[PDB]
Amino acid sequence: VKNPSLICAPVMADSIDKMVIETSKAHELGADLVEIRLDWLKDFNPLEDLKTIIKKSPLPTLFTYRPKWEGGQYEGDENERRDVLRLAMELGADYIDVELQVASEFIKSIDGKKPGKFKVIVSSHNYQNTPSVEDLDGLVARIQQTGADIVKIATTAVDIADVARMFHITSKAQVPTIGLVMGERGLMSRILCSKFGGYLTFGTLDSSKVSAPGQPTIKDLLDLYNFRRIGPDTKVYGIIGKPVSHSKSPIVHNQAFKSVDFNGVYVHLLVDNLVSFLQAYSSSDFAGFSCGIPHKEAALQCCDEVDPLAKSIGAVNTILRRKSDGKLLGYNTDCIGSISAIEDGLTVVVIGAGGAGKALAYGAKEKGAKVVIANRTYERELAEAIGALSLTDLDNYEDGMVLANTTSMGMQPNVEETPISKDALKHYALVFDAVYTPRITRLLREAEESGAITVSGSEMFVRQAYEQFEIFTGLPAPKELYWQIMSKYGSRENLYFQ
Amino acid sequence: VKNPSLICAPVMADSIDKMVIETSKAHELGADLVEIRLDWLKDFNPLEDLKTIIKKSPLPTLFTYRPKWEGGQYEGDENERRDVLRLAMELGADYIDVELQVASEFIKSIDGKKPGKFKVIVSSHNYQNTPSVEDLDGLVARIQQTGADIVKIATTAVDIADVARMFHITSKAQVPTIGLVMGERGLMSRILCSKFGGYLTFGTLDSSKVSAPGQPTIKDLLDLYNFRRIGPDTKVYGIIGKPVSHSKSPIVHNQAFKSVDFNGVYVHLLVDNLVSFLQAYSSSDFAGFSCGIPHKEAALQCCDEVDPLAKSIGAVNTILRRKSDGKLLGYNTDCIGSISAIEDGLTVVVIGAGGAGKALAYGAKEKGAKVVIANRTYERELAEAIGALSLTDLDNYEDGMVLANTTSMGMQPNVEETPISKDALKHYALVFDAVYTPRITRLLREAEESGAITVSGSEMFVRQAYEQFEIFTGLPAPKELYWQIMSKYGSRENLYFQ
Ligand SMILES: O=C(O)[C@]1(O)C[C@@H](O)[C@@H](O)[C@H](O)C1
Ligand SMILES: O=C(O)[C@]1(O)C[C@@H](O)[C@@H](O)[C@H](O)C1
Numbered sequence: 001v002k003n004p005s006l007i008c009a010p011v012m013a014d015s016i017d018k019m020v021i022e023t024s025k026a027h028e029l030g031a032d033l034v035e036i037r038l039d040w041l042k043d044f045n046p047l048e049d050l051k052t053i054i055k056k057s058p059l060p061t062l063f064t065y066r067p068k069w070e071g072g073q074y075e076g077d078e079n080e081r082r083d084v085l086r087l088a089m090e091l092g093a094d095y096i097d098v099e100l101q102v103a104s105e106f107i108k109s110i111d112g113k114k115p116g117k118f119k120v121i122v123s124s125h126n127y128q129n130t131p132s133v134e135d136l137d138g139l140v141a142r143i144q145q146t147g148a149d150i151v152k153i154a155t156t157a158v159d160i161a162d163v164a165r166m167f168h169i170t171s172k173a174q175v176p177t178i179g180l181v182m183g184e185r186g187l188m189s190r191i192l193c194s195k196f197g198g199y200l201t202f203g204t205l206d207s208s209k210v211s212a213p214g215q216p217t218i219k220d221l222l223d224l225y226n227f228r229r230i231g232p233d234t235k236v237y238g239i240i241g242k243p244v245s246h247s248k249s250p251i252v253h254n255q256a257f258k259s260v261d262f263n264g265v266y267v268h269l270l271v272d273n274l275v276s277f278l279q280a281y282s283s284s285d286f287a288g289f290s291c292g293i294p295h296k297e298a299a300l301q302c303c304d305e306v307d308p309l310a311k312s313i314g315a316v317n318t319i320l321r322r323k324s325d326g327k328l329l330g331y332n333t334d335c336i337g338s339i340s341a342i343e344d345g346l347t348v349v350v351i352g353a354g355g356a357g358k359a360l361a362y363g364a365k366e367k368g369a370k371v372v373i374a375n376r377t378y379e380r381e382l383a384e385a386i387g388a389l390s391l392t393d394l395d396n397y398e399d400g401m402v403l404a405n406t407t408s409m410g411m412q413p414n415v416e417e418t419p420i421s422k423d424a425l426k427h428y429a430l431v432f433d434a435v436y437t438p439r440i441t442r443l444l445r446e447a448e449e450s451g452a453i454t455v456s457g458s459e460m461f462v463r464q465a466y467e468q469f470e471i472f473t474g475l476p477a478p479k480e481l482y483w484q485i486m487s488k489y490g491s492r493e494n495l496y497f498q
Numbered sequence: 499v500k501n502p503s504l505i506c507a508p509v510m511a512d513s514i515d516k517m518v519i520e521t522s523k524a525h526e527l528g529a530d531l532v533e534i535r536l537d538w539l540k541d542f543n544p545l546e547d548l549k550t551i552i553k554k555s556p557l558p559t560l561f562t563y564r565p566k567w568e569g570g571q572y573e574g575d576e577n578e579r580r581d582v583l584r585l586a587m588e589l590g591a592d593y594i595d596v597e598l599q600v601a602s603e604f605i606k607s608i609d610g611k612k613p614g615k616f617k618v619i620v621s622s623h624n625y626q627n628t629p630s631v632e633d634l635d636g637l638v639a640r641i642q643q644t645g646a647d648i649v650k651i652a653t654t655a656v657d658i659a660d661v662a663r664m665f666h667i668t669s670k671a672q673v674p675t676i677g678l679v680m681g682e683r684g685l686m687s688r689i690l691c692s693k694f695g696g697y698l699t700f701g702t703l704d705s706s707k708v709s710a711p712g713q714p715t716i717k718d719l720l721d722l723y724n725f726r727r728i729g730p731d732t733k734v735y736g737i738i739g740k741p742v743s744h745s746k747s748p749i750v751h752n753q754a755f756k757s758v759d760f761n762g763v764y765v766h767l768l769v770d771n772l773v774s775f776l777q778a779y780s781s782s783d784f785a786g787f788s789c790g791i792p793h794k795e796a797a798l799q800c801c802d803e804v805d806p807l808a809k810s811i812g813a814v815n816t817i818l819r820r821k822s823d824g825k826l827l828g829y830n831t832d833c834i835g836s837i838s839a840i841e842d843g844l845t846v847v848v849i850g851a852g853g854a855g856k857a858l859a860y861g862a863k864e865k866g867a868k869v870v871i872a873n874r875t876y877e878r879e880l881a882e883a884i885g886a887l888s889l890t891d892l893d894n895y896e897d898g899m900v901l902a903n904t905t906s907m908g909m910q911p912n913v914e915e916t917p918i919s920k921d922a923l924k925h926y927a928l929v930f931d932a933v934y935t936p937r938i939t940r941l942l943r944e945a946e947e948s949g950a951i952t953v954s955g956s957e958m959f960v961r962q963a964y965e966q967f968e969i970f971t972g973l974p975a976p977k978e979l980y981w982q983i984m985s986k987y988g989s990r991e992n993l994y995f996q
Contacts, residue, residue, distance in 0.1 A: 069743065069911060069994050073706055076992055078911045105914045127681060127711065128656055158626055158656070183625060208571055213625065245567065413567060413576045416603045494574055496567050 001176055004231070005193035006032040006200040007221055008062060010211035014042040016049045020056045025205050027058040029218040033094065035202070037211060038065040038084060039074035046084045050091050062095040062121070063088040070099045071125050071212075082106055089118055095150070097121040103146035121178065122148035125212075130155035130162035130181055136169050144175055150199060152178040154212065157186030160271055161280035167196040182213045184245065184498040188238070188267050190216060194230040195265075195285070201227075214498070224251060226258050230265050236285055237472055238269040240277065240299070240319075241292030245270070245498040246412055246437040248490045249290050252465050253472070255485045262473050268497050274298050282326065288472045289319040293408055296334075296355025303330030313362050315355035318468050331471055334359035337464030338404070338434070339367060345430050345455035347372065347398060351391065351419045352407035353380035356434055360406050361386050372397075376407075395421040400429040403447075407434075410441035412494060418442040425450035436461045438493050462486050499674055502729070503691035504530040504698040505719055506560060508709035512540040514547045518554045523703050525556040527716040531592065533700070535709060536563040536582060537572035544582045548589050560593040560619070561586040568597045569623050569710075580604055587616055593648070595619040601644035619676065620646035623710075628653035628660035628679055634667050642673055648697060650676040652710065655684030658769055659778035665694040680711045682743065682996040686736070686765050688714060692728040693763075693783070699725075712996070722749060724756050728763050734783055735970055736767040738775065738797070738817075739790030743768070743996040744910055744935040746988045747788050750963050751970070753983045760971050766995050772796050780824065786970045787817040791906055794832075794853025801828030811860050813853035816966050829969055832857035835962030836902070836932070837865060843928050843953035845870065845896060849889065849917045850905035851878035854932055858904050859884050870895075874905075893919040898927040901945075905932075908939035910992060916940040923948035934959045936991050960984050 009026035011034045013019045019041075023034045036053055038044065054061055065081050066072020074081055085096045089110060094117060098106045103122040114120075122143045131139070136153065143151045151173065155166060163181050166189050170179040176199045181189040193201045203218035204210055221227040239249040245268065253266035264287070271277045274295045291299040299316040300306060304327040310316050316330035338360040342348075348364045350357050353375040364371045365386045373383040378390035389397065409419045415438060425431065431447040436457030444454045466482040469475070507524035509532045511517045517539075521532045534551055536542065552559055563579050564570020572579055583594045587608060592615060596604045601620040612618075620641045629637070634651065641649045649671065653664060661679050664687050668677040674697045679687040691699045701716035702708055719725040737747040743766065751764035762785070769775045772793045789797040797814040798804060802825040808814050814828035836858040840846075846862045848855050851873040862869045863884045871881040876888035887895065907917045913936060923929065929945040934955030942952045964980040967973070 067911065068705060069996065075705055075994075078913045078992065102911055105912065109914070128683075185626075207566060207573055413565065413600055414603065415576045416607070494576065496573075498567065 001170070001173065001197045001199065003199075004228070005198045007203050007218060007227065008033045008035050008200050009059075009205055009218060010035045010037060010202055010209065010215070011205075012037045012040045012209060012211055014040055016041065016044075016052055019053060022205060023053070023057040023059055026218070029205065030222050031059060031203065031218050033060040033062055035062045035064055035097070035211070037072075038063060039067070039072040046087055050084070050088050054088075054092050060094040062097060063093050064097040067099065070101070071127065078102070082109070086110060089115065093118065095119050095121055097123050097152065100124040100143055100146065103143070103148065107147040119149040120147070121150040121152050122146050123152035123154070123178075126153075126155045127182075128156055129158050130165055130186075133165050133168060136165060140169065140173050140175065140177070148175075150176045150178060154180050154182055155186075157181045157183040157189075157214075159273070159276070160185045160188070160269060161276055162186065163189045164280050167192070170197040170199075172197075184214055185270050187214050187216065187498065188269070190214060191221070191225050191227070191267050192230060192236065192265065194227065195232055195234050195236070216497070220497070224254060225265060225267065226254050229258065229263075231263070233263060235264045235287040236267065237264055237288045237290075238267045239290040239292055240269045240271045240274065240295050242271060242294060244268045244292065245496040247292065247497070248437070248461070248486075248495075249465065250497065251490050252462070252482060252485050253469060255489055256466075256469050256478060256481060257473075259481060259485075260473070260475060260478065262475065264472065271295065274302060278302050278328070284321070284323070284326070287321050290468055291317045291319060291355075293354060297358070300330060303328045306330045307332065309335060313359050315358045317355060317359070317464070318471050320471055332359055333464040333467035333471070335363040337460045337467065338406075338432070339363040340463055341455050341459035342402065342404065342430065342432050343367070344459065345432070345453050348402040348404060349374055349389075349394075349397070351375070351394070351403065351405040351409075353377075353382045354406070356406035358382065360404055360434075364404075369402075391419060394419070395424045397424065397427075399427045401427055402430045402432070403428045404432040405434060405441075405443055409435075410443050411435045412437050416442055418446065422446040422450060425452055428452045430455060432460070433457050434460055437495075439491075458486060458490070499668070499671065499695045499697065501697075502726070503696045505701050505716060505725065506531045506533050506698050507557075507703055507716060508533045508535060508700055508707065508713070509703075510535045510538045510707060510709055512538055514539065514542075514550055517551060520703060521551070521555040521557055524716070527703065528720050529557060529701065529716050531558040531560055533560045533562055533595070533709070535570075536561060537565070537570040544585055548582070548586050552586075552590050558592040560595060561591050562595040565597065568599070569625065576600070580607070584608060587613065591616065593617050593619055595621050595650065598622040598641055598644065601641070601646065605645040617647040618645070619648040619650050620644050621650035621652070621676075624651075624653045625680075626654055627656050628663055628684075631663050631666060634663060638667065638671050638673065638675070646673075648674045648676060652678050652680055653684075655679045655681040655687075655712075657771070657774070658683045658686070658767060659774055660684065661687045662778050665690070668695040668697075670695075682712055683768050685712050685714065685996065686767070688712060689719070689723050689725070689765050690728060690734065690763065692725065693730055693732050693734070714995070718995070722752060723763060723765065724752050727756065727761075729761070731761060733762045733785040734765065735762055735786045735788075736765045737788040737790055738767045738769045738772065738793050740769060740792060742766045742790065743994040745790065745995070746935070746959070746984075746993075747963065748995065749988050750960070750980060750983050751967060753987055754964075754967050754976060754979060755971075757979060757983075758971070758973060758976065760973065762970065769793065772800060776800050776826070782819070782821070782824070785819050788966055789815045789817060789853075791852060795856070798828060801826045804828045805830065807833060811857050813856045815853060815857070815962070816969050818969055830857055831962040831965035831969070833861040835958045835965065836904075836930070837861040838961055839953050839957035840900065840902065840928065840930050841865070842957065843930070843951050846900040846902060847872055847887075847892075847895070849873070849892070849901065849903040849907075851875075851880045852904070854904035856880065858902055862902075867900075889917060892917070893922045895922065895925075897925045899925055900928045900930070901926045902930040903932060903939075903941055907933075908941050909933045910935050914940055916944065920944040920948060923950055926950045928953060930958070931955050932958055935993075937989075956984060956988070
């Protein structure tokens with residue numbers, strides 16, 4: 001429906017003076033409005049304090065006095081709570097949020113007494129699940145019937161497939177709708193509002209100031225996900241994985257998209273079940289995916305056509321949805337990214353026998369000295385398929401070898417986990433770690449002080465990434481750009497997007 | 499497993515000095531220990547601050563430094579976070595909670611370096627659902643394998659039936675287990691820990707200081723639910739309803755149980771689906787239920803035997819599980835409680851045609867002047883079955899009549915909702931409102947200033963309640979006691995138990 005989504009900053013400071021500073025900070029960061037969470041004030045003098053906030057806020061104000069029975073902090077008399085909201089309205093609030101449960105009564109109380117600019121949000125919060133389209137429709141209709149100006153429905157993501165139902169509601173409900181899905185699995189619903197008709201989304205002043213599960217920062221909305229550029233025609237891409245919150249794929253692809261003015265947006269896709277995910281998001285809206293752990297090997301099966309190199313490897317890390325058919329095309333950019341990063345660093349030992357191990361093993365047998373496979377589960381077979389070893393014995397194994405970790409071992413937050421004893425490392429000339437979060441794993445740290453050559457995950461990451469760009473956009477990989485983007489925007493540690 | 503459950507108070511103040519005061523308050527209220535949520539400190543000087551807390555706390559200390567990726571507030575370096583926890587241990591902490599994800603690494607780091615009193619909790623938090631017993635078992639086994647001293651598993655209640663699986667885990671896992679289910683539908687799991695083997699439960703300093711959804715206060719655990727009296731043999735009772743959070747049935751029945759030293763405990767039962775609920779909790783552990791809206795009429799069907807008065811009414815508000823069979827016996831205490839309350843106040847108009855309306859209508863035709871039925875949906879038929887009217891017309895209707903609301907209209911938080919216009923009230927001698935939360939509804943308020951006689955919900959509530967006691971316990975209804983209990987413990991307004 002109508003306008004691009006607004007960005008609202010929750011203001012939850014426990015004193016009036018700190019709230020005022022928070023509204024200023026909201027203006028600074030680029031928020032469009034603020035939600036004043038009155039129920040978070042430790043001491044509250046309604047007449048005096050409401051007046052102060054409305055006077056001093058540089059942004060339009062939305063007031064919320066959230067009761068315990070709707071997930072809030074306010075306990076006490078219900079009429080007094082409504083008095084405050086009515087007061088906010090007549091003191092010049094731009095919005096109040098009133099709970100569906102008491103909305104009929106409340107809107108009756110201000111009938112013919114509303115100021116000209118004033119809008120009433122009527123909200124419903126579901127902390128269990130995301131109901132069927134049938135039930136959401138009934139919920140919209142009920143909220144409309146209270147006399148709401150704006151409908152607000154927050155649900156909870158049990159699975160990422162849930163978000164599609166919320167998109168359908170914001171997309172087609174003929175009433176201004178704030179429709180958001182909480183939880184890490186609902187994060188996509190907070191980002192893509194401007195594509196699917198959402199009236200507003202909440203972005204935090206910073207990560208410590210979250211008012212409901214899954215909210216990103218205002219800064220990430222604007223600068224990372226390029227919120228203002230997202231529109232009805234924007235194509236959606238994302239990294240399919242579990243976990244997913246460490247991935248810097250959305251950082252690099254969104255910068256690149258923006259840099260070449262490509263109408264695409266890239267998000268995190270926390271996916272429990274690959275098959276159900278691809279079925280839930282089969283529309284043209286969803287144009288391509290990167291595939292991470294644990295879905296690489298799996299994605300090879302869900303693809304309708306598979307690139308020879310990908311079939312020869314047995315794993316897909318990149319999925320393109322063809323405009324023509326609607327059919328999924330699978331590629332693998334892990335192989336060349338791994339090999340090229342290693343060669344640039346200059347028999348190879350490949351840790352792990354998942355999708356990345358497959359790609360790195362395959363490419364290693366192709367380009368000179370060749371390969372030993374090492375994995376947790378010994379059966380992972382791979383070593384026979386390309387010409388084995390278990391990591392129980394990996395410490396026990398030439399003195400100028402190459403080691404290549406392709407597992408998640410060492411990945412944040414498991415920063416003291418290494419796949420091999422430091423003592424075994426001085427028998428290696430070079431060691432490659434696919435893990436790029438953190439940049440210096442325990443493996444790479446210990447390998448460096450073992451005299452060996454270290455090639456970090458980012459060397460692999462950037463290479464496989466600009467190849468995914470090319471697949472995604474059909475535009476020549478802007479390699480120099482992707483290096484520049486990673487350096488400038490991809491260098492911070494301990495980031496979780498969730 | 500082993501000891502009665504401990505009561506732990508979450509300490510979340512954002513400064514060190516305020517935390518110290520909170521630990522003292524915890525001691526005051528009766529908590530057994532405190533969980534120091536280090537990730538909530540705005541300014542933190544680990545060495546100095548840890549020392550202060552450990553020195554000044556009157557209670558055993560559990561330290562938690564919860565990262566963003568596990569629902570906490572801490573962002574930053576992972577090794578620094580672990581350093582703090584290790585420091586807490588060596589400064590004399592009684593426990594630390596370390597997240598399952600990094601527990602192996604962490605416990606390896608303190609191997610042979612743990613103080614004598616010190617225990618390591620290893621925790622897993624599930625904000626989506628409550629997994630199958632199969633998956634919970636695997637989760638227990640994984641947590642055990644890290645070298646945990648104590649297993650902590652928090653899940654989320656999608657339905658109240660979920661809690662039974664958590665009870666099975668705490669009951670039978672041969673390792674100290676903290677097993678809790680979050681959300682209003684999981685509240686029962688926090689109360690009944692001492693019956694089902696739980697090592698610990700969290701209770702708040704007050705309702706504003708909740709660290710995870712559904713936690714009751716320490717004061718309610720101890721004084722309302724009689725936490726210390728709950729044991730493996732305690733029989734469980736509860737109010738089945740939706741909503742349920744307003745009910746004072748747990749206040750009155752737990753006082754009565756305690757007063758006559760009956761080994762029972764009464765909780766809120768937020769039930770979406772009656773049939774599935776009764777199936778999930780069919781064991782002897784669950785000995786009886788009160789039935790509220792919307793399950794009264796329904797419960798009549800789920801009962802194996804039905805008391806004549808209940809069959810004659812068509813609704814069950816009390817369910818007893820017979821020790822003999824295991825079979826459900828249904829009774830109705832609404833009829834006599836409604837009628838007696840009205841008579842004591844001294845043609846009748848009955849608002850509502852649910853379970854309560856049925857009982858009140860039936861008893862009214864039996865005892866003198868007789869009855870007109872009024873309901874939202876006009877078809878609710880009732881008026882023919884006992885000898886009709888819709889509330890659209892109820893305002894339009896002798897000058898010494900009796901009005902009896904038996905719906906939830908006017909119930910908190912809908913305090914300005916009344917089922918009838920004030921103008922129609924001066925045509926009534928007496929008006930009864932089954933709603934006892936709040937005590938003075940809009941209906942009773944306006945009726946009093948309309949000159950009429952007012953009989954409040956509590957007159958009905960207490961009467962039907964001591965009759966449920968008699969059914970539940972087989973002990974003579976201590977009527978004077980129930981009046982005294984309601985007066986002393988049941989008088990506070992705007993209480994939500996959730
Ligand atoms: O975003 C990531 O960290 C990736 O997982 C890196 C590497 O695994 C690629 O093959 C995936 O497509 C994306
Ligand atoms: O706890 C309540 O408020 C009740 O709902 C009051 C009345 O409805 C009784 O019949 C129920 O058993 C309990």
